[PDB]
Symmetry: D2
């Protein structure tokens, strides 16, 4: 069969194909309480009916002031568990595995009131200047990622992804452009990686299954992080037991980025080869042929699809047709697929 439709086992989890629905915020928690709504249920469950191997739920805030917007999903309260338990059960019933992206927006939070970051440096001229987190607050935030992971386990998720990309809180600590701290969380690469190191270790105290980390593999900026820095972080993550690195890029600060089909694939390939770490490729992958090429040429292990799944929730069927292969159809749609 085609590699895109070949299984892969990570820890005790077996994915039936290599297609992953990339985490994508829906800004649909209209009651501003981080809870799920019927829209979210239909949105996610339809891609499970659509046969996506693994569906990663959008950035879910570990603290309310870590939301990107006040309509974001949250996982900062035990009240969020009931809704997620229904979602995981329904997605798995349709045949898919499900994960959740744990997040904190840091200086990119678009909320009223103080927002937080490793250093008091604004994202851009249109943004509020964040408050530098005290060491106590940094440690409390590590505990919030741990507590959120425990809630995700209770809710029944199969995979937990740590959002260490797109200019959000963890990425701000990793990069010298945004982290000018003079304590244990700033300076050397070891100190800049410390926040993420502590989050991974603490999450591992309450969660043993698949652990993914999404990174922005380059800042595309002078004096910022580049792929060499991320290969270094990837080797430390492998030592800590991270199972896969989801390779994105950018958004710490505004930058000129040449976007084209597969523009982030080189990051996934280099981290996979140099850090001996399984990787997820993402970024303008819109068809089965490219997905198959990426996997067959050993550039990544999982293919993350974002916008094409917004256009075609049944991308798995489309890709199977493009690759002239067959895949099981949801039972209810057998006189159509």
């Amino acid at each position: 069969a085609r590699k895109l439709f070949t299984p892969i086992t990570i820890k005790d989890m077996t994915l039936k194909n290599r297609i992953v629905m990339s985490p994508m915020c829906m800004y649909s928690s209209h009651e501003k309480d981080g809870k799920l709504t019927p829209f979210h249920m239909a949105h996610y469950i339809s891609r499970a009916i659509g046969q996506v191997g693994l569906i990663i739920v959008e950035a879910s805030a570990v603290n309310p002031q870590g939301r990107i917007t006040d309509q974001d999903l949250g996982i900062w309260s035990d009240e969020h568990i009931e809704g997620f338990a229904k979602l995981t059960e329904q997605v798995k019933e349709q045949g898919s595995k499900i994960g959740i992206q744990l997040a904190h927006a840091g200086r990119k939070a678009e909320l009223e009131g103080d927002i937080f970051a490793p250093s008091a440096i604004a994202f851009d001229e249109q943004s509020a200047t964040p408050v530098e987190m005290s060491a106590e607050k940094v440690k409390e935030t590590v505990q919030e990622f741990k507590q959120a992971a425990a809630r995700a386990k209770e809710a029944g998720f199969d995979v937990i992804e740590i959002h260490a990309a797109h200019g959000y809180l963890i990425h701000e600590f990793l990069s010298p452009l945004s982290n000018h701290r003079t304590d244990e969380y700033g300076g050397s690469p070891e100190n800049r990686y410390r926040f993420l190191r502590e989050i991974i270790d603490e999450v591992k105290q309450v969660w043993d299954g698949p652990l993914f980390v999404r990174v922005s593999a380059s800042d595309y900026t002078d004096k910022g992080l580049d792929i060499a820095d991320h290969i270094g972080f990837a080797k430390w993550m492998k030592e800590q037991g991270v199972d896969l690195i989801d390779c994105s890029s950018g958004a710490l600060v505004h930058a000129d980025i040449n976007v084209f089909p597969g523009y982030q694939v080189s990051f996934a390939e280099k981290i996979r080869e140099q850090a001996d770490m399984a990787t997820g490729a993402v970024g303008m992958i819109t068809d089965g042929s490219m997905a198959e090429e990426i996997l067959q040429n050993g550039r990544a292990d999982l293919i993350f699809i974002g916008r094409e799944l917004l256009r075609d929730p049944f991308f798995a069927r489309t890709a199977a047709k493009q690759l002239n292969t067959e895949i099981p159809a949801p039972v209810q749609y057998e006189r159509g697929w």
Copy 2:
């Protein structure tokens, strides 16, 4: 713009486009009680996110012994109202109008215990011989359609469609191949149409909104009904206030049917022209170009899509692209559509 994406008003109901999700059984009421399940919610709401103008819910039985299978949806009990009320609210919130198809499978019911029909004639060699309904039983069934319509109104549906096609109960009364009665419900075309006439009049006593009737416009069998018979029934339905005839065909008995793209369109165009009745075209319509041609050449008023919406829930977007035109995207997907 494109006619397919131009609004149309029927009664006090305005549809934002002319794409209709044809009713399609999901055989997913697992507890055998006719109730909705989470799968049904995701299945239907996803096409509302997908911008279908009107979603018609699958054949819903007006009597438990009128189900096609024991996993069918039902609307024979007030217990069914709560679930439908949630479904109509959620589909409408996503921007579509919603209808329900009221049904009774007659001699094609695949259930244990006596099944019913206008005459004791089995569908085929592998089916049970049905019990000839007494006139009392026929009248009780008319009241069940009325009671089901009252529940549909309470549950918030925008449109009610009467299932008078596909060899089910009403179609069995209409055709001389299946109706050999010698009382007021058989013999002449007027008497064979009487059951449907009474259902329409009684439904109108509790429902003043858009009323559609789905017919099988031909039996494709010698001595059976053909399009001329249906043009006659359509004129009678127009006098009774039916708003649109959804034009399907076949399934009263096994028959050789030549299927091809648009194979039932001639029925919709002839009834539209000769009975001066709005019509719905359905049958192997899978792309926007054909849909637009049907509407622009005056062959039908609404385009019903079945299997293509099982392969592509977002057919509206695909058709808009094929017709090189722009349509609003659900707000959550503006970055992908």
Copy 3:
């Protein structure tokens, strides 16, 4: 199989499928002598490699002053025979049948010097007023169509089509908007049809093969011709032995025309049914599904494709795939098709 790919016989000519390359001017006779050039050869032969059943060569003038532009192909001279003989041999060797459209642009000729028409009425504000043809000149033109048909027979064409559409000479005689004559060629519908009647009878004196006539089935103008007029002309053409009417529309004068997929199909279906004449459908037909529907619903006998064959010379292969059916590939491309 699919009707689009089923053979059809007209006279002693069997077409392997029902796809026709509609005549389309290439404005490529650079020496202004009406002769073929290497571009024309590649242009036409490539669609024969592409499996089009019948290729109709673009409007070819029967008189030099009847060209639309000075870069048009011509068939007014015996010097044109040699080039056409090579083209017909080469297209037929690749497996297709070939036709030629005999033409005279009348008042729409974009040439210096006097241009001709049934009456001295200009096409529009930016066009020269034509010279009213004397009866002698009309008769000379009928002989030029006859002489051109004899050359087409000598050159090896399988089909001859008379261009009586698009506001050109014959169409100008047919319509009361452009023909104000008071002699035998004007006044009544019979007199307005006389020029075409004489062309058909004279062509039949030198050609006994398939004879097609392309018409503009409506002028889309008050007091102009409409489909009822053309159904009448079609009955007369049937009596004269015309084999098929290629149904186009418009262009006699500027008019508002609503264009959409299949916008001229109603003309082909009405002439086919009411005049009992085989018809060719043309106009925004771009996919196999629509083509198959037109044929299966009895709206036309042949499907003419214009612009889609300019975008996709191998439309036959694309349509076969869309219809999930197999067709023979040119032997040279068996490893790709």
Copy 4:
């Protein structure tokens, strides 16, 4: 603009886009004299109308007994010049550049009579055992490549490609699996490369423009050539002035090859990076998105397309649409493209 539609200059030749029609035998020289036929003219010229930047004519034999089949094109005689001169002129007139692949089938020639190779080893059990070329015959063959290059220059080609792949004569000398010679043309990599070295040097005596060499970058066989061997040959070719290496693979002997979209791209990327040589990628590249990714990620400089151009001669237009960009249309097709 997109890199696929960005120009590139090689020597004095500027290609308007990066799409190349890969050389593909047509087995259509039916008179068995190696001459062109009308089919070849339409076949090649149509892809020039289709806007392919560079069209490489199929393997053309430098000696009649070096043909793969007796219906192959040839360039072993001055009689072949006239036909090629017409083809190059017509392809360039449509806006494309044109090249020719100089070839000798060696032990894979399917001809009657003795066939030749570096050693008397048959291709497989179904093939004739070739005659080991004497050193004099090897030197005569080098002169035949030189003489053929002179004919190609006279005929007006813009690029000459040497066919050193697919198990044919030059590849047989390069590989230890097929070359067991004990003279100056066998043994060490220097001796095995000598035949190709002499061909390149001699061709350079009569041809200064763009010179491409197509190689099979792996034999996929134990003790055969692999990418490391070809990076070595590529460095020697760069020293000799070869402008680009067209990277194919296989066919020296039967082997198990895992084929998938982009399966030969790694060879193009490694030779480009390690030998600082421009490269052509080929092998199951069927869409614009993959073509763009290959170019943007620096894996190759030109994208060679084979079978997709047999299915879609106007692939350039299709790819431009896929990449949401615009490209000039052939003038004759402007109301269609």
